[PDB]
Design a protein around this ligand. Structure first.
Ligand SMILES: Nc1ncnc2c1ncn2[C@@H]1O[C@H](COP(=O)(O)O)[C@@H](O)[C@H]1O
Ligand SMILES: Nc1ncnc2c1ncn2[C@@H]1O[C@H](COP(=O)(O)O)[C@@H](O)[C@H]1O
Length: 203
């Protein structure tokens, strides 16, 4: 009951699909070449977080019916076998959404709204940071470009492609507990930060 803030986590689809993991496009076809939503996670300032707050509250698709087509494109599941994303959304809703104090519809609308508000791809483009092979960009340039359009610093999570290149994988931004506005992150994710120069791979 109650938490401190939300980590709003977006992902670069291309970086989930160029590793040794299996990646399958959603039953709706190849996803947009844009940052997608991974999740909206309630969190505590002490680094821990609540999860699975209502193991009885299953995902009611009727509450987000008119949002399904948008989510298939902005919150796709890239896991295999190819799915419609419902399993992925049900998982995020049960594990994290039930702990957000938000109704199911508000929770998913919130995620969609912040993905749009943060407008990562465009902000990067405005700084001449566009997808291409190889570790062509400085982490600093990427962080500031995002800071410019959001007004808050993001945390960048990097992984590695089959080539061994370090690439931008996920972008963390913090949202206030009422899911109204972006805020400065009280704390940043555990895992190791990125290298000084990283790859922003295309599909
Ligand atoms: N609120 C959180 N803050 C930091 N890491 C998290 C949080 N919730 C989940 N994780 C980790 O990040 C990944 C997100 O997975 P999931 O909870 O399935 O969306 C898992 O590998 C978790 O260990
Ligand atoms: N875009 C995605 N579609 C479906 N599952 C995902 C996606 N991104 C992450 N996952 C899975 O959720 C978990 C999150 O861990 P991580 O790979 O560290 O982000 C892993 O078991 C991933 O396979």
């Amino acid at each position: 009951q109650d938490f401190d803030f939300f980590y709003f986590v977006q992902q670069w689809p291309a970086s989930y699909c160029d590793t040794r993991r299996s990646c399958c496009y959603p039953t709706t076809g190849k996803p947009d070449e844009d940052f997608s939503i991974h999740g909206l996670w309630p969190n505590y300032e002490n680094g821990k977080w609540p999860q699975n707050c209502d193991r009885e509250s299953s995902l009611d698709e009727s509450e987000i019916s008119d949002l399904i087509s948008t989510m298939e494109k902005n919150w796709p599941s890239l896991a295999c076998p190819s799915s419609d994303g419902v399993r992925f959304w049900s998982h995020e809703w049960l594990k994290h959404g039930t702990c957000s104090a938000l109704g199911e519809r508000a929770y998913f609308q919130a995620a969609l709204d912040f993905r749009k508000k943060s407008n990562l791809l465009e902000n990067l483009k405005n700084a001449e940071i566009t997808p291409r092979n190889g570790e062509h960009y400085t982490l600093e340039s990427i962080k500031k470009a995002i800071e410019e359009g959001v007004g808050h610093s993001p945390y960048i999570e990097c992984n590695v492609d089959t080539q061994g290149n370090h690439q931008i994988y996920q972008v963390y931004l913090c949202v206030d507990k009422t899911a109204t506005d972006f805020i400065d992150c009280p704390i940043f994710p555990h895992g190791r930060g990125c290298g000084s120069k990283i790859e922003f791979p295309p599909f």
